[PDB]
Amino acid sequence: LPPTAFTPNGTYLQHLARDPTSGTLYLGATNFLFQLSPGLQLEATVSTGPVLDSRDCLPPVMPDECPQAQPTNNPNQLLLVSPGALVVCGSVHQGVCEQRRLGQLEQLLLRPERPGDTQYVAANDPAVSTVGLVAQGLAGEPLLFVGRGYTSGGGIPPITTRALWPPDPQAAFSYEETAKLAVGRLSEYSHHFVSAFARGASAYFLFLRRDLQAQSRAFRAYVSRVCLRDQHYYSYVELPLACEGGRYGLIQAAAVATSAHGEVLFAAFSSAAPPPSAAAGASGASALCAFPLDEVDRLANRTRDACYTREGRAEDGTEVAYIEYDVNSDCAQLPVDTLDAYPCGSDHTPSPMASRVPLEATPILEWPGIQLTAVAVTMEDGHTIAFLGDSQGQLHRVYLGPGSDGHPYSTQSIQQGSAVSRDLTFDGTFEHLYVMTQSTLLKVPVASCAQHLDCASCLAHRDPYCGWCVLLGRCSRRSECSPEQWLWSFQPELGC
Ligand SMILES: *[C@@H]1O[C@H](CO)[C@@H](O[C@@H]2O[C@H](CO)[C@@H](O[C@@H]3O[C@H](CO)[C@@H](O)[C@H](O)[C@@H]3O)[C@H](O)[C@H]2NC(C)=O)[C@H](O)[C@H]1NC(C)=O
């Protein structure tokens, strides 16, 4: 009865967003927006282009003012579900956004009639990623954190906090001039955003940028952190990521443990090719690293502490923190009380801070001929399981528990030769995983224990999800065994 696949014709897919509330999926495609049921049933379709456009011109694109306007396709740049609306940002018209009714994709709520430079949100070029994070203000108001990667005018701050629904709704998607990360030489740093996410009272960003502190000026992986309430980016701090000592320098994808939202960040990294492309085919390798978010916070906190009170030196020895992006600021010898008084900083504290000391992780998975593009991690019966996507449109399933090499328990083709989107998202019950490539979307079950009819078959075909439920006479997940005697396939040791 329900579709098992979604293959839209005459388009390529960019983004996927799941509505936690209703289960509804939204799809960002070239000149199209789709609304699907949790069962992949097509519910609504909206056209987004082509449009008369030019990156040199400002919206509304007027032919008399922009004679070089030519029909342009509109790949989806950003697609996020907020309590009130569906947030939609395209590659076209300077990365302007809109708000659509959730469940009624056709219904437009807000699309500013005559927008200004302060409302150009997303990267106005496909080929360049944009990241987003829907959060709340102190009053519960909806905020959108944006990671706009550098586009060759696009002199827009790399990270911003824009209001989704302010007093004047015509002023939506604008940041308060203060709520941004001012970087003076964006062309030189060349940001490449991967993911944006939250934990506690903080928004975090995963990205590549050139490490201009190094004579090499080579691209490096970084984790970034700002307080959710901080409207001046005072609390902003950067940490270099290492996996393992930069052998796999380029971060590709990351996800946190979900079954709800863990405390560990799982990040797929690929080794670099001679813009920051990962070495392709058998010449390049990938690795999966785990960075517990407390370790992230410990280091950011000690980067802040050093920079605030002990001139970024930090006893005993020394030179652990500094001011990044060439900003005319320096680390300080401020009172100790500053740490407690100003956790998210102030007008007097040094900003933007960054660590000299990187956050180091050793891989748990090291795949020599594979180029990882997507990460999704879940937890079944306390055991950590990872669903990883690659450049060839494969989906590998990896048990990541005690004493296991990064080897996959299964590998399947989603779409030969088409990279799996970073947008790997489970369903409400964690029974399925939505797996998207550039031309298809599949509702992939997390297990098929059911397929094995006897105990012999159930244990012979090792899946961490599966075991033999004795009292039920069925091959199942532990949760389905009712807690009774359940013969786990990864730990058989008799007696059937
Ligand atoms: C990084 O530094 C920040 C402070 O700048 C640390 O935040 C403080 O962490 C403590 C530890 O839990 C928080 O205390 C607890 O708050 C909970 C919330 O209700 C309460 O139930 C506990 O009984 C306890 O009071 C404190 O509120 C928090 N303050 C702020 C401003 O966040 C953070 O924990 C440090 N992280 C690491 C990894 O070191």
From Swiss-Prot:
UniProt PTM: Phosphorylated on tyrosine residues by ERBB2 and MET upon SEMA4D binding. Proteolytic processing favors heterodimerization with PLXNB2 and SEMA4D binding.
Residues carrying sugar: N9, N301
Residue ranges occupied by any Sema domain in the UniProt entry: 1-446
Disulfide bonds: C57-C66, C89-C97, C227-C344, C243-C289, C307-C331, C449-C466, C455-C496, C458-C475, C469-C481
Known tissue expression: Highly expressed in fetal kidney, and at slightly lower levels in fetal brain, lung and liver.
Subunit structure: Monomer, and heterodimer with PLXNB2 after proteolytic processing. Binds RAC1 that has been activated by GTP binding. Interaction with SEMA4D promotes binding of cytoplasmic ligands. Interacts with PLXNA1. Interacts with ARHGEF11 and ARHGEF12. Interacts with ERBB2. Interacts with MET. Interacts with MST1R. Interacts with RRAS. Interacts with RHOD. Interacts with RND1. Interacts with NRP1 and NRP2.
Function: Receptor for SEMA4D. Plays a role in GABAergic synapse development. Mediates SEMA4A- and SEMA4D-dependent inhibitory synapse development. Plays a role in RHOA activation and subsequent changes of the actin cytoskeleton. Plays a role in axon guidance, invasive growth and cell migration.
Family affiliation: Belongs to the plexin family.
Protein name: Plexin-B1
Originating species: Homo sapiens (Human)
